[PDB]
Amino acid sequence: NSFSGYLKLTDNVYIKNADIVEEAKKVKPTVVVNAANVYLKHGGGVAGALNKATNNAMQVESDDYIATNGPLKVGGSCVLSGHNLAKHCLHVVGPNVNKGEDIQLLKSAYENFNQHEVLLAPLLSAGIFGADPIHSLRVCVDTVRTNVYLAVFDKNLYDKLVSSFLE
């Protein structure tokens, strides 16, 4: 958990302009959060990047989990191996508002982080999931009580988020 160069927003929420894959390699976190979908198909974006960094071992494990347990629910999660990126990967499904899912499920999605003491995570439901990233950060700060290090891989969005928080 050797997080470096983060800006502390509250006593338990930190943020950095960084690629979550590169952070996972530098930090060696106990838990890395994946921005998953309910069938754990890591086809692109954050999930595709984390799977590629494991040389597809995350996707094979994920397929075996789904075969035995069935899909997750939106707002839900599961704990699988972190492979070379962390001790564990917490796969969390935030709502995809571009696909009609309820933005209220973003609170349930962040609540899964409270089962782990320290996590490296992306900003849930942002990017092509369509939620307003300023709102996602607000839900994170209000919901997460354990220690969360957010990696946001876009300096333009990072600056807007820090300027929204410090208003």
Ligand X SMILES: CNCc1cc(-c2cc3c(N[C@H](c4ccc5c(c4)S(=O)(=O)CCC5)C(C)C)ncnc3[nH]2)co1
Q: Which residues bind ligand X (CB under 6 A)?
A: 19-21, 35, 45-46, 49, 122-123, 125-129, 151-154, 157
Backbone torsion region of residue 21, taken as left when φ is above 0, otherwise alpha when ψ lies between -120 and 50, otherwise beta: alpha
Of 49, 11, 59, give the one whose Cα is nearest residue 151.
Answer: 49
Of 44, 47, 16, 31, give the one whose Cα is nearest residue 116.
Answer: 31
Task: Report, in Å, the least distance between residue 22 CB and ligand X.
Answer: 8
Task: Return the number of the residue (67 or 112) whose C-beta is nearest ligand X.
Answer: 112
**Polymer length in residues for the chain:** 167
Task: Return the number of the residue (68 or 133) whose C-beta is nearest ligand X.
Answer: 133
Task: Report, in Å, the least distance between residue 19 CB and ligand X.
Answer: 4
Task: Return the number of the residue (68 or 100) whose C-beta is nearest ligand X.
Answer: 100
Task: Return the number of the residue (65 or 153) whose C-beta is nearest ligand X.
Answer: 153
Task: Return the number of the residue (61 or 154) whose C-beta is nearest ligand X.
Answer: 154
